[PDB]
Ligand binder design. Structure first.
Ligand SMILES: [Co+2]
Ligand SMILES: [Co+2]
Ligand SMILES: [Co+2]
Ligand SMILES: [Co+2]
Ligand SMILES: [Co+2]
Ligand SMILES: [Co+2]
Ligand SMILES: [Co+2]
Ligand SMILES: [Co+2]
Lengths: 386, 386, 386, 386
């Protein structure tokens, strides 16, 4: 079962199924895919849409006539299949000119070029219907301490994002930005390394309402963080504008495994939170079919991303709907966690002897939280062992 | 040389040199220290002051007469030595009542008690002259996904911090709060796990100006992050209200080694940034003399925290003052990083053919950043090998 | 379903369900358990047996009459329940005398005492029927580089293990040793940090046949390693004498979560390998019910260790027995991996033009490994989604 | 000062200074270097020699006449400069045919080809005077659990190494093998992930004396391990046949920073151990000048590898020679660590009441180890702050 359809809003980057398998130690293992063929294959699997970097759709250095033809073929494939383009982004990391950054390159001419390259692709993104424009500053950072003054780099990164907000406002575009954190790789340390740092940075932009985050499962896990907890803080802040789904085994190079691989229980709690919270954005996969695979394995890996999301969605819904789980959640006081601490106000709390002088600390300490019984009901639901 | 004096503003927690050596697998290796003796010994070493949790100064469950006598003896030791108390904090983690949290415990009665316990110690902190009140929510978090809804927990954590801000405002106190992130330990994941998450959270409090961060070297390193980069983002945001200095070897349990141990080059770049930025707060050590040590080793370890800061301060100042380093920083375009990208404005950037149509991308890509020569001058300065 | 019975050979340490909840930052949350009560409760859950450190069964410093009474009560509980004692071990880590090690303490008198304490408990272990005697050198190591010369420490560690082998041989005992690696915690680095280092060390003991490894899920995961791969290398070497089962979330402090928690897919592949290989030793749990729990939560957490093993055993058996998986394993050439590379011999390989001069490297490179389809069949079996 | 000369035995791989800067997310930033030019530039810096993979010296797929000309030009550069070739190795990782491994590929034809490719380059290595032949099985491993049965893969890896030992013995060559562990990257988990696993594996080869390890600083640090401790265990086993020197910041992708970068104190203790132990092999750098650099930065980064080794060699020698350090080492009982525990024998230990019945455990526990004073003397020596 678990068959995706376009109504599930699953999307994939052209660069995901199109990854040719080159890595730090290895040459390509697959031929390049035409974006037209990836749109057709993904639609056959039940995807809703695709996303692109500028340079995935239009080879870098293309003439205007070449650009127009690449976009015309791609639009025909979208129209032939009903696929959408909800998100686009800029490649500010592959070309050697970006070796020290795009928006925070030490060279000022490079920073200006990075902005012009981004702006040209925002116009194209809006042409193709994108609602979200992602920015992953993979080259922003350093391998050594003297190379990059981070307060000056954050001043340049704020100027860049502010200028992009002024551009979209000036054009009357509805598109919003989603900043994608990553802690390292390819730079030794990347600026805005986690969801928290990106959220904090956005609050200092001139028009914060135009910007949110695009967290990626594997990126937060490369810092050993809890990805569902970081998504909860982004939702709490109203800033989950987009999300990248994949798998990662803890603290390593960015593996980009299919979604559901890597930390399976974290995938379960992530789906439980997105579905509980009513997240309505695309369920986007930023993954790489392993370079061991041929094209049949590429499409099997892409299909597995969607299948795993739909299995986990069913099991998380059954967990939350089970009367036995609902009783366990009240036994563990999840209902009390959702009640205000002191709606009575500060003076009432200060005058409340039950909160201090007559609080029986030992009786409260003795009360078990019952978290292990609750977690084994969660395990039983995930494994289909109820 | 490298002799600290009280003018260097070095401070230590009572619980640092007073740690008796109990760990997950081991009993105490040292007897308890009277706070009066730790104040006298630290002052002899050249410290400026000390800090405390409530329960380090006044044993938990003390009567009012016992509380008054503990505080009177401590005040006499401060007066005898000239030591200050710049910071205090609450212990919301040791007693079993806090096993699921203080401010975000699922039990509402526990959350109210945690607030009352904190408020009682804010009054004492102000009595003793503290300017900063730290909050390390070490028990806020979870070992399992169903135990803690993080959006509800952040709602409780905001209510708690807002009530503390209303209390200090109502009393006319000048004290400010500093939230201390940690990614895990003792909980499997701790809420507000990094400097970024704490900065983002503060922006949603009702009176954000009252709150900053108290980052700790080892805590950000437990997530594999670059501690100088996170301090730069806190400085950029105007939120470095306090800092905890120690050593850590990467991604492990919290080691709390003396400052300068663990990642030595990160200690160098940290001191370079604090001194360059003119940070004026205490240089506070939150460390543990290893449990292998006797009391002579406790004081040698405390002395080493201050010595290492002063050696690194000298070498970072010599690096920044060296004409050869200043020329290397211009060769690596650190001066251009500090210039605005587009003070000419968005329309001028859009009309600038030198930023796109006539930008020679290959000539810019060919220009080396000269970062390795700059970093080996930094290495040579740190090692005294110029 | 998934009800364990003593025939499943599940065992637990007294110190697991008996953990009182003390951690680096927290006091006990549960009262001490009498070993007699833990034997009765574990037997009711379907355990096969229990294991102990000397000091869990006989308080440190007990008189001979106290020792005899503790052992007599424990033996009565074993006889009343039918529980076994397959393994015992020494506590060479809690008492402050072991602050720098037992067998590799810098103090020679401490090393001799550690050996005498171990030998006294080997005699008791044999009295109680244990076949395996574990040694976890949690204090062997260092926080600083000058404190511990590791070649001298390995010379002391080999002398200690050789003397223990001479003792068991001299007594005619059948018991064998199992060395338990851990990479860090409580020492900053622990000697013999992984399964590989322990296996390599054993090959240099005088009677290597007497020693194997007791790997623990969470310990290898604290180094970011693949626990099933390390168990495969221990099985390949004939050295898996015992195993400790629990859960861990990657690279952190040792969490000791119940088995099946932490890395669930690694738990699946571990059970698949132990069952495929016909491992016949105890399935021992070295875990800690979280300190949030009361005693009801302790027994629920212990029950969950066994339940998760039995669910994973069923799903791994169904995976290996499924004709569709067997066809996928041949499509991925798992059958060819198990065939000798060159049973024809070196000269035949050198003379084989199909291995070099006429090997079509591009045709072989083009053949996909089909690993993603195989892994999604594994995912579907684990989740009960076939 | 700190000028290297060929007598310091510093060597570099052609692929180190020749790295063109391609990474998972980026195109080359530097042109290819002719090996003749790298030999000349490295000799000018004071290197002793160079090392190569087959495919660095002879492009893959070269004809015999092309092979002969590449080798003739390289030999002329060695003769012109006096540079040596102490080590060579095979590239069994770049070409797509090795996407699932060389020696442990699931495809048997690939395993046979990997052996033939290795054997052809052993002959060339011996022609050029190499004493050590490295094997880094970077493709041996898996991203998923069903793809690779590790006991079958270890059987194939032992067959491969045994056949290589039979080949060198049959030819009467003096060359020895050095197996290079790495825990992950490019495979999700690599087989023989650490020094310990490689040492353990070697003991099961048919002629173990022909094989040792080639540990790399950054590889063991990618598992969070202590690299000096792993080198000490390799020295203890008599198996340090070669070593790769570089820098790494903990648990991340393999950074290959210049030696002395990354964990500086670990670099200090490594040099102290190699020099103390009288290691006589090459001091080989396996590093990558960052892709931010031009060729001037490549040679500055290479020069910095050698400079940092020579600074650390001076400071470690001064530490060990300082009478104050020698007194601190006796205060910390490093002398007692080097004395046998029980040269009196097992029966004497059993009859020694001073080892048990009359051992004053509390007096021994009270004695501090004085490790912090010793470590701050080490810090002071490293920083030139005595
Ligand atoms: Co990624
Ligand atoms: Co992404
Ligand atoms: Co800490
Ligand atoms: Co702290
Ligand atoms: Co453990
Ligand atoms: Co264990
Ligand atoms: Co490397
Ligand atoms: Co290497």
């Amino acid at each position: 079962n678990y068959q995706p359809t376009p109504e599930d809003r699953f999307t994939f980057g052209l660069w995901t199924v199109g990854w040719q398998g080159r890595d730090p130690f290895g040459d390509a293992t697959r031929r390049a895919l035409d974006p037209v063929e990836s749109v057709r294959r993904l639609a056959e699997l039940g995807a809703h849409g695709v996303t692109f970097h500028d340079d995935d759709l239009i080879p870098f250095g293309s003439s205007d006539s070449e650009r127009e033809e690449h976009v015309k073929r791609f639009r025909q494939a979208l129209d032939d299949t009903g696929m959408k383009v909800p998100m686009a982004t800029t490649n500010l990391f592959t070309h050697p000119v970006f070796k020290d950054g795009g928006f925070t390159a030490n060279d000022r001419d490079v920073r200006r070029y990075a902005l012009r390259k981004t702006i040209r692709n925002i116009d194209l993104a809006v042409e193709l219907g994108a609602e979200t424009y992602v920015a992953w500053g993979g080259r922003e950072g350093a391998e050594s301490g003297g190379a990059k003054d981070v307060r000056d780099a954050l001043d340049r990164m704020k100027e860049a994002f502010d200028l992009l907000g002024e551009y979209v406002t000036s054009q009357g575009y509805d598109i919003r930005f989603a900043i994608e954190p990553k802690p390292n790789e390819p730079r030794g340390d990347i600026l805005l390394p986690t969801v928290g740092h990106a959220l904090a940075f956005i609050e200092r932009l001139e028009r914060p309402e135009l910007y949110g985050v695009n967290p990626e499962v594997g990126h937060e896990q490369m810092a050993g963080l809890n990805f569902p907890h970081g998504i909860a803080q982004a939702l709490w802040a109203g800033k989950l504008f987009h999300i990248d789904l994949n798998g990662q085994n803890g603290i390593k190079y960015d593996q980009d495994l299919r979604f559901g691989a890597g930390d399976l229980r974290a995938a379960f709690w992530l789906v439980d939170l997105l579905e509980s919270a009513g997240y309505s954005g695309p369920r986007h996969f930023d993954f790489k079919p392993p370079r061991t695979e041929d094209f049949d394995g590429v499409w099997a890996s892409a299909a597995g991303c969607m299948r795993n999301y739909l299995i986990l969605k069913e099991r998380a819904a059954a967990f939350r709907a089970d009367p036995e789980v609902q009783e366990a959640l009240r036994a563990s006081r999840l209902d009390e966690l959702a009640r205000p601490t002191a709606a009575d106000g500060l003076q009432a709390l200060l005058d409340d002897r039950s909160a201090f002088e007559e609080f029986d600390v030992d009786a409260a300490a003795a009360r078990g939280m019952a978290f292990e019984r609750l977690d084994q009901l969660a395990m039983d639901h995930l494994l289909g062992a109820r």
